[PDB]
């Protein structure tokens, strides 16, 4: 029960951190999603939206606008940015705008989901991981952070 054996340190109300040591390919199937700048939402749409399409990512971004209206004023990773709701929605809902940790936190709250972001080394070994939500990891959405620049979807094998 390795993934369940992983211990997470709380760094927020909705966010935890960990330093695991394994190759993501041994426990997960990687579903590579396009390099169009919308892959965070493309990788979420593959795992969450039941109907798969090249434009399923838009549905995830639209769910994010509702989530930002609800939680962006009270989000910890949003207190750092000098951005307020209306600027964020203009910037983020645009094409080729990178999503990630801040977007995953609000989506985990608004959709009642637990989102885990696994970071890799270029050999598929995990350098670290962030979990948004405290739900079970067998029901969670698994995302791969290749480099610090790309997001692919992960399905449990």
């Amino acid at each position: 029960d390795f993934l369940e054996g992983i211990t997470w340190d709380s760094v927020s109300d909705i966010q935890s951190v960990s330093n695991p040591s394994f190759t993501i390919t041994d426990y997960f199937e990687v579903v590579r999603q396009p390099a169009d700048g919308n892959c965070f939402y493309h990788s979420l749409a593959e795992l969450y939206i039941p109907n798969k399409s090249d434009h399923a990512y838009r549905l995830v971004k639209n769910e994010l606008r509702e989530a930002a209206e609800k939680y962006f004023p009270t989000e910890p990773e949003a207190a750092a940015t000098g951005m307020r709701l209306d600027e964020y929605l203009d910037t983020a809902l645009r094409d080729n705008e990178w999503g990630g940790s801040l977007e995953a936190a609000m989506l985990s709250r608004h959709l009642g989901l637990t989102v885990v972001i696994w970071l890799v080394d270029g050999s598929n070994r995990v350098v670290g991981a962030t979990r948004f939500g405290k739900g079970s990891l067998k029901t969670a959405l698994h995302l791969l952070h290749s480099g610090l620049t790309h997001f692919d979807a992960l399905r449990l094998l």
Partner: protein, 75 residues
């Protein structure tokens, strides 16, 4: 005071600090050592975000306390 800063990769930075020092100063120390600009760094102690204009003694951070440097992930 030798406080430890923990990152998402598991990297640990030991900083020599004084209890009167502000989080802004701790962020400037990390910037000089790792090159991470203070606008991009979230210092967190016991699951709470640390404000720049407040001191370590106000947050009750002591000699071998370990803070967390949580970075914004985009991809």
């Amino acid at each position: 005071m030798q406080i430890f800063v923990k990152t998402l990769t598991g990297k640990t930075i030991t900083l020599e600090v004084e209890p009167s020092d502000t989080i802004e100063n701790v962020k400037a120390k990390i910037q000089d050592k790792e090159g991470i600009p203070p606008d991009q760094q979230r210092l967190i102690f016991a699951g709470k975000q640390l404000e720049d204009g407040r001191t370590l003694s106000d947050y009750n951070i002591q000699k071998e306390s370990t803070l967390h440097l949580v970075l914004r992930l985009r991809g």
